[PDB]
Structure formats: structure tokens, C-alpha cells
Amino acid sequence: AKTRSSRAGLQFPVGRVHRLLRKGNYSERVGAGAPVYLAAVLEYLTAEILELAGNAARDNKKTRIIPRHLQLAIRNDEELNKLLGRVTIAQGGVLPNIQAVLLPK
Template identity: 55%
Template sequence: MSESQCDMESSEELEPSRRGRRPKTSRSCRAGLIFPVSRIERFLRRGDYAERIGSGASVYMAAVLQYMTYDIVDIAGNIAANDHKRRIAPRHLHETIHCDSELQWLLGGTILPQGRATSKKRPAASTRRGRGKKTAHSVRRSHNAAVAA
């Protein structure tokens, strides 16, 4: 939901003929959240988690889920930017969960599809592209490095 959908002043100007009636606003808008409060309440009631569920429980749950989602996506975005990527891949989410101690405690047992293990130090990329012919100089240099090790 964008802020314009939650803006009460603009909706009052559109309907001047209705006196005494307040325009309908969702509970998500009233709470200032993006996550759907009503849908979360429906899931809580159908989930048989408790006999009674307070009206504030779904608002609180939506706020927690929104905060956690923002935090995870923010850290994963930073990791993607460090990899010089513009999109967040499952690998970035996996690294996010396993680098942060609190997220590791909470989501440590979660399996992400295509979320490969965190990479150790990657070797520096060579400036040479493609698979050209090996020159005698590069063969000697790799042989000398192997002998020295």
C-alpha cells in the first residue's frame, strides 16, 4: 500500500456528500504498516493457536513481520551490492541469515532453495577473459608457483 492510499485527507475531499460518515481505512493504514493486518488476523484465528486472540495481536504480529522483512532485505541488499549485483539472490539471503547472530538463532534451521553455503574467500578474478591459448610464460609461472608451494 502506498501512502496515498492511506491518506485520509485526500479521501475526505473526494466524498463531500456523505455527512457524518468517516471514510473506510484499513487497519494496516491506521497502524502505519504495509503488511496486511486483517489477513494476519484471519490466519491467526484459523490457525487454532489459541482460543482467544486479542485485537492488537494481529497488528503486533504484522509489525514484527514487517520489521524482520525490512531488516533481512536491507542486509541482503548490502551483500548483493558488495558482490556488484543489482538483484538479491537466494545466496544473499542465505549469507544474511548465517552472518547475523540473531537471525542465525531464529532462522538457523531454515533451508533456502538455491541458497548455497556461504563462500569462503574467493580467489581474485583474473583480468584476462576467455579461454585463450596458454603462453609459455603463464605455464612457467603456474609451474613455478606449484613447485614453490
């Protein structure tokens, strides 16, 4: 009795992703590789942002990731920022950024 995740070499739940697919009315039938492939991409993406959030935490001398850390990680990464360009992170604030023309001469 091996979980599909271990067979897939994944942390994310393959069986759960599969269920969500069948129960989401996406298509009549769902292939066996579909949930495996999607669970992997999901896991890859959450790893990429936890990596950068963890850095932001570290940079700010905190050991526990909080929303502001997620925001700094998202907005400083051209790609994640693009991917989440219409997303609002509750409690994330904005990137500190003051237009040059506004500073004293």
C-alpha cells in the same frame, strides 16, 4: 474506510494476519491488538533481512536479490543465523570458509 494496516502505520496486512490467527486454531478468541503486533514484528524482521540481503546484492554488484544473497545475509548475522539455524535456504549455498589447518604452509 481505513485499512487496519494504515491505522497501524504498517505495510504488512493487519486484516490478513488477523484472519490467519482466527483460522489457525491458536485460541478461541483473538484480540484486536494481536494481529497488529504480529504484523509489525513480521514486517520488522523481513525489513531486517531485506536490508542485509540488499547489501549482499550490492557487495556482489547485483541489483536483484537472489537466494545466495539471502543466505549471506542470514549466515553473517549472528542473530538471524541463530533464528534460522535449522532452516535451509534453497539455492543459498554455504558461506565460503576453509579451515586454517587445510591451507598450504
